[PDB]
A paper describes a structure:
Schlafen 11 (SLFN11) is an interferon-inducible antiviral restriction factor with tRNA endoribonuclease and DNA binding functions. It is recruited to stalled replication forks in response to replication stress and inhibits replication of certain viruses such as the human immunodeficiency virus 1 (HIV-1) by modulating the tRNA pool. SLFN11 consists of an N-terminal endonuclease domain (residues 1–353), termed Slfn core domain, followed by a linker domain (residues 354–576) and a C-terminal domain with homology to superfamily I (SF I) DNA/RNA helicases (residues 577–901). SLFN11 forms a homodimer with the helicase domains adopting an autoinhibited conformation.
Residue numbers in the entry:
A (entry chain B), B (entry chain A): 7 to 158, 188 to 353, 381 to 519, 530 to 899
Write the structure that this text describes.
């Protein structure tokens, strides 16, 4: 059989000695020539169906030869096109001849799913009657036929006769429904055994028909066979055995077998019996009938294996990120934009960390990157772990190079020379290349080279020039498949792409929401947890100054909490003040007002709503903009907020799509929101919590959620400290992490005890929520962190004075986390 | 040549005498066989590209015969599939053999428009190099190739040599870029003539290449040709002319010819000159190169004609209603709903008129329709006029039968028998069948039979059974293609289908607009003329009743004009009253208030806006719905309306898409709306008229708009009577017509005057604007018709006391017409 050889970062199949050249292949016998051709075509079909590769064959001569006309024509039949260069390219060196095969279909969701078949075959074994002939369906014809089947006569008079006269003339000719076959007595049982599999499936696949055996084709004479050789009882058994042996695949209930009527009639000569005539009526079949298993091949594990009939039909009729496929062009420009003129190293934070730890690493990389003047060099502490492979001790970092006028190269950097290092780098380069096609949907010609570098001071296959990245179009198309591949795994770059997907979902919802500015002057925005309520408020104030041409100091932002005030005030889009500041000072110059977390406001210090209404209505442009953002699920107290009654809060906009938290976090939010509806707080209005999320809305972003309980406070700190160190080793920055506790008075206690464990991790710098621009882990209370968000959030000991508000802190805490949430409840 | 036979309701081509049967065709000489096959495939390709038809051929035999393996294979190559039954079906009676051909691609906008090619060809004349061979692209390959071209070496070392030794071995073999031709002196000039169109277009179409002439293929020896026979200057000219003769098609600029380098070199034997060798380097071409004109055929008028190279490329790369195609299933189910169990005659209104005017027509139609038990019989006074053909005097009516277990039949009824009757029906049945395919996009097998019936007391082909209508699915699909065909013509059923497209457009805009009910309690709707403002107001009251679960009498509709008030009351969706009635009577029982035509309201009777707010705010469910509909383009007076200032009219909704008027009416409104912007009325606030229609919005419904000026009052009424008589004769109803005058005081004058001219047209009854349910023509003033609408409107002398309000009168008049508007301005 054929075996893929594992000394290469690709699928390489050795077919052995092959005769090449047309004059050399002519001199061969038909048997040997056909065996060689079939071996080469099995290898080519396997590589077409398995994501591409190289066919290695040994030629018997030194001088360059052509491949041969029969091999060319078989490849043309294999891809159903004369454009043989699009999928095949040939190289030869001395005694070895290479065919580089490109993948037929790429990705789980190709752009041609309903157009082109997913598989190539040597034969589909699907035949149909085509007027007076039987033709096998090619891959496209078989694809259309199975698509059709999956969707939810003068000849009968002769068939009704009980006997036939010898030499009788049949009035009808051969047609779409009639086939005449002459029955020879020397091999009659063998002849009928091979006639059945080729004409019965053809009739059943198209409208049925009549098969007459014993009728001369040219003269239409009924002759039959010798009476002494044919046994009508024995002949019947052979025919029915062959008909029921034909493989059948059903797309329907019931699954009744093939239906036919077989009649053996006597052929009478001069009134005396001369022999028997075999007549078969084949009824049309509900589904596809195969004469045998399809001749399609695929590579699975280390062997070249043939697809079974049921598996072949499955692929011919039929983590993957839909968001990654949709936004792949936007995502690539954000993270993997290729700069013209120089080579870019990403991630830059990880690159600085690596060169600081390892002396001479920067010179090793820089000396290697001299030939390449444009592209990107993507670093990772282990690209194997990023692709769900095994971590190798001794590997410093893995770098993937995507540069112009070069093939992709995977660099594995070792601290010391290792024998198994080459196998580790080849296995990772193989996995990456296969993911780029079968997962990233790359439809071009791709190869990833495996190179090992050592810090301490098998031959490489030569691919055609079409495998080198020619320019920006090739590099961008390849990097857009890496975006899709990365988003299906858990890694730093996967998390950096996941954050940007959440930013694109928010930007999509904002454009729908931003259309309300023209239609409204006063608006109440009832946005669900995780719906981007604060992000929309920031973007609206950017649109207000653009649309109304007012200055930034003419727009006022009012919020309850100081950390959220500081975050907004640092953006320089408006003036940001606290409710207590709002009631005290005078804001007569303000034209537009945006109020956020208004459900957290309090009446004890004055009527803030009347003042906000008064300022905007007396403004120059009639009633100025007064938009009030609130979330009744995140109420922080049982006091009266000062908002108008729920029936007076009109007009309304509702943000029901969760677009700021990953899929595990979002599902936790909907679960906890259902608990609130089952027991709403008394201060909250009765029907406001009846706002439900979208019926079926998903983010398409991977996330993390673990709930760890019954741990002591000291054990809690060690779990937080160990988790952060693992995050920071892979390249995560400390400014992606927040630690949120129940109350602000416990912030000082937990800060000391966390710093006690975190000092062992070379991290002794912690900040509160009032500072979010520094590169430090923020530790503060859940309520004081309102409106802010971090990628990684640790929830430690949720608590409140009244258990009625207790389910709120879980919603308030979980909505602060974008991708990773760790909860440590009381026990 | 091949000529279309004109006596049939289909494209019929007679190819004459053809030998059929495999044994009969094998006995023929090759030239005769190929000529007959080529004639048959010319006919088949023409019918495939021209909407389908029948190939008529006379066979040299009486008994039934098969068609022949070469003919079968040629048809399979023509359609690129072994499914020969889907496009070709054969019949024979006596000495005639019929091939029934289905259309390859149907409709201007096929579903596979971006997938499958539009044309079938016997050859594309597009060759490309496929490794060491030249292969022609079939229709799918050429389609993809032209799509790709549309978007925006060791052999070089030998090429640099100036002289070559006789018998020198070339190191490289034949490949994708290298071809060797052996050059014989007997036909050396003739050989060059043929080799250039074969290999140069193949190289130019795929990446260029090298063509060496004078090198043996098998041994790669440089031989050249005899020095005595070759003229190197003459030989160079011959090659240059042949390359420039190749037809080229450009999808770009510039359009330079084929770039190549031709080199003639000397062949030296034993140090002595032996002859010359020709080496040609072909650069890749920017676009498609043809070896000759494509072999594709089409039917134009009564001839079978071949497409030119530029016309073939145009079809392969590249009144029709967009709205009709998208709504074809809903439009079909509205008008042409097929009933199970009985045969339906449509239209009922036209059918009653026909049987009353003509004695014995009812029994004549019922006698013919007895074999048909399920289907629809579509009547018209002249189906030829509907399809832009000339009317025939003496034709009572035409009917199109679409029934189960039958082919479509077009019946023409004559009052006396006529020789030209059968020619008139056949030309209409031919035109209808070609429209159903080429315009309505029917992808099935269709034939329209032409039958002529006489009221006063060539042979049709027997089509295959696959041309009959088997059941509901075949009948519905054909009726959906008739909807698309009818909407592209001017006829009764076109206007009934055009009105329903307007109702579907209005229902689409309401679904967008009805989402504001959950968000707003008080809302101001600023709709444009023709935006469906009164239609939305009625539909909202249905949703108010359903959403708020209040009964109908709790909803109040307030308008300014009595005729609009009675229109709303007749639908029983609310309580509907006028402004004066609203201010007088008590409405404490009212919860929700909808106000329409609010710009026409007046202040002197009281403060209606405050009363509306008071009633709605004091409702049980807090603030009730208070929606106010208004358009400042239909402002009928210059007084104060009582509306709050434009700055206080928030929240605001705008209906900017025109969905109630046909395209000629819609375009007139936009032009007239532009005049109002340049001269706003003083009573309208400054920023009101700045509402602009949708950037690019079209109705996709065709209509009529004519201006007839300088006519006298007596002349005007005769034209109205003549136009109304023409509409009613064609089957329109009087309730589709309104005659609108400038002032209500002149209504009594024009009513008597019109009745004087209209009595000759056999109706002596007119109805007022307050009565819309009667089947009578409505005559009143423009102002009293506000909020109402008719299909046909005659506008007579638009006039007002102030020329400032005059330009609105054209808007208030034109927007009342859905499809047909006739204006008679002052002279
Ligand atoms: Mg046969
Ligand atoms: Mg050759
Ligand atoms: Zn089945
Ligand atoms: Zn060009």
């Amino acid at each position: 059989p054929l075996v893929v050889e594992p000394s290469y970062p690709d699928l390489v199949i050795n077919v052995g000695e092959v005769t090449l050249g047309e004059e050399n292949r002519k001199k061969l016998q038909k048997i040997q020539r056909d065996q060689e051709k079939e071996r080469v075509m099995r290898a080519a079909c396997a590589l077409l169906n398995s994501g591409g590769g190289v066919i290695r064959m040994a030629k018997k001569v030194e001088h360059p030869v052509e491949m041969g006309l029969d091999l060319e024509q078989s490849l043309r039949e294999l891809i159903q096109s004369s454009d043989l260069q699009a999928f095949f390219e040939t190289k030869q060196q001395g005694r070895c001849f290479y065919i580089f095969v490109k993948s037929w279909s790429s990705g789980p969701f190709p752009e041609d799913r309903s157009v082109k078949p997913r598989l190539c075959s040597l034969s589909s074994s699907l035949y149909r009657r085509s007027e007076t002939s039987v033709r096998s369906m090619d891959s496209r014809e078989a694809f259309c036929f199975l698509k059709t089947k999956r969707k939810p006569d003068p000849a009968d008079l002769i068939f009704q006769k009980d006997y036939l006269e010898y030499g009788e003339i049949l009035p009808f000719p051969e047609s779409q429904l009639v086939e005449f076959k002459q029955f020879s007595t020397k091999h009659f049982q063998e002849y009928v055994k091979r006639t059945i599999p080729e004409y019965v499936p053809a009739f059943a696949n198209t409208g049925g028909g009549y098969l007459f055996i014993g009728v001369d084709d040219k003269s239409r004479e009924v002759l039959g066979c010798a009476k002494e050789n044919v046994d009508p009882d024995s002949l019947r058994r052979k025919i029915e055995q062959a008909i029921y042996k034909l493989p059948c695949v059903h797309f329907c209930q019931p699954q009744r077998p093939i239906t036919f009527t077989l009649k053996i009639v006597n052929v009478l000569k001069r009134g005396e019996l001369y022999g028997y005539a075999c007549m078969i009526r084949v009824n049309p079949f509900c589904c596809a009938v195969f004469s045998e298993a399809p001749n399609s091949w695929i590579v699975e594990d280390k062997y070249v294996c043939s697809l079974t009939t049921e598996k072949w039909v499955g692929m011919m009729t039929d983590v993957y990120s839909k968001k990654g496929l949709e936004h792949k062009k936007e995502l690539q420009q954000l993270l993997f934009s290729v700069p013209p003129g120089y080579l870019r190293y990403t991630p830059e934070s990880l690159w600085r960390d690596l060169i600081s730890e390892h002396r001479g690493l920067e010179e090793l990389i820089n000396k290697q990157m001299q030939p390449f003047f444009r592209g990107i060099l993507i670093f990772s502490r282990s690209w194997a772990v990023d692709l769900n492979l095994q971590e190798k001790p001794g590997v410093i970092c893995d770098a993937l190079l995507i540069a112009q006028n070069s093939t992709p190269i995977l660099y594995t950097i070792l601290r010391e020379q290792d024998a198994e290092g080459q196998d580790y780098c080849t296995r990772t380069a193989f996995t990456l290349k296969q993911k780029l096609v079968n997962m990233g949907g790359y439809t071009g010609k791709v190869c990833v080279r495996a190179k090992v570098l050592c810090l301490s001071p098998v031959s490489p296959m030569d691919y055609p020039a079409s495998y080198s990245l020619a320019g920006t179009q090739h590099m961008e198309a390849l990097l857009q498949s890496l975006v899709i591949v990365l988003l299906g795994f858990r890694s730093l770059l996967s998390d950096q792409l996941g954050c940007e997907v959440l930013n694109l979902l928010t930007a999509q919802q904002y454009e729908i929401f931003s259309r309300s500015l023209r239609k409204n002057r006063e608006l109440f925005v009832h946005g669900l947890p995780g719906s981007g309520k604060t992000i929309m408020a920031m973007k609206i104030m950017e649109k207000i100054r653009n649309v109304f041409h007012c200055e930034a100091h003419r727009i006022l932002y009012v919020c309850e909490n100081q950390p959220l005030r500081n975050f907004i005030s640092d953006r320089n889009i408006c003036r940001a003040e606290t409710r207590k500041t709002f009631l005290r000072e005078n804001f007569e110059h303000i034209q537009h007002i945006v109020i956020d977390e208004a459900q957290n406001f309090r009446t004890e210090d004055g009527d803030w709503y009347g003042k906000a209404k008064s300022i905007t209505r007396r403004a120059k442009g009639g009633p100025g903009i007064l938009w009030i953002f609130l979330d009744y699920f995140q109420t922080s107290h049982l006091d009266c907020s000062g908002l108008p009654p729920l029936s007076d809060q009109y007009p309304r906009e509702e943000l029901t799509r969760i677009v700021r938290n990953a899929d595990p976090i979002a599902k936790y939010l909907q679960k906890e929101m259902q608990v609130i509806r089952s027991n709403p707080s008394f201060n909250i209005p009765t029907g406001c919590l009846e706002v439900f999320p979208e019926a079926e809305w998903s983010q398409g972003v991977q996330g993390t959620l673990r709930i760890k309980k019954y741990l002591t406070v000291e054990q809690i700190m060690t779990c937080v400290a160990d988790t952060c160190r693992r995050f920071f080793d892979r390249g995560y920055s400390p400014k992606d992490v927040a630690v949120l506790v129940s109350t602000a008075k416990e912030v000082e206690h937990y800060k000391y005890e966390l710093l006690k464990a975190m000092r062992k991790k070379r991290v002794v710098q912690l900040s509160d929520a009032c500072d979010m621009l520094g590169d430090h882990i923020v530790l503060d209370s859940v309520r004081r962190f309102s409106g802010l968000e971090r990628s990684i959030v640790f929830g430690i000991h949720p608590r409140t004075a009244d258990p009625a508000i207790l389910p709120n802190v879980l919603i308030c805490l979980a909505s602060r986390a974008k991708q990773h949430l760790y909860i440590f409840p009381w026990g």
